[PDB]
Amino acid sequence: SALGKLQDVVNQNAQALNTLVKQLSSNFGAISSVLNDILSRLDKVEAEVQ
Amino acid sequence: SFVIRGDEVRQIAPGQTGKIADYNYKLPDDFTGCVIAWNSNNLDSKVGGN
């Protein structure tokens, strides 16, 4: 209960980096979250828009 | 300037693929300009084939 102040600073920085890494799996409305899987399955101008 | 059949005129644009685009005449992805076309059957066809 006392050392929770220092542990929370560790937990907040770990949760922030986990959130930043998990956001690589998001689409944002693109066809895919995987960047090679866009390029290997679309023509140049279409892949560029995704 | 060139002649091609009326179908293949659709390959004459930036970002297209197909043998006229890819093996004959490729426009840049950053092209600035106008593509102008017309049917020339009366000039460019001949009986027995041109």
Please specify the SSE layout and strand pairing.
The structure is cut from a larger assembly and holds 2 copies of chain A (50 residues).
Chain A: H1 4-22, H2 35-39, H3 44-49
Strand tally of chain A, please? 0
**Biggest sheet of chain A, open or closed, and with what strands and sense?**
none
Q: Tell me the quaternary state.
A: part of a larger assembly
The share of residues in extended strands of chain A comes to: under 5%
Q: In percent, how helical is the residue content of chain A?
A: 55-70%
Broad structural category of chain A:
mainly alpha
How many helix segments of chain A? 3
Protein name (chain A): Spike protein S2'
Coiled coil (chain A): 7-50
PDB class: viral protein
Keywords: SARS-CoV-2 Spike Protein Trimer, viral protein
Give an account of the 3D structure.
The first copy, chain A, has 50 residues and is an all-alpha fold. Helices cover 60% and strands 0% of the residues of chain A. Chain A contains 3 helices and no strands. The termini of chain A are far apart. The A-B interface holds A 43-45 and B 14-15, 17, 29. Chain B: This is Spike protein S1. Chain B: Residues 5-7 are annotated as: Integrin-binding motif. Chain B: It comes from Severe acute respiratory syndrome coronavirus 2.
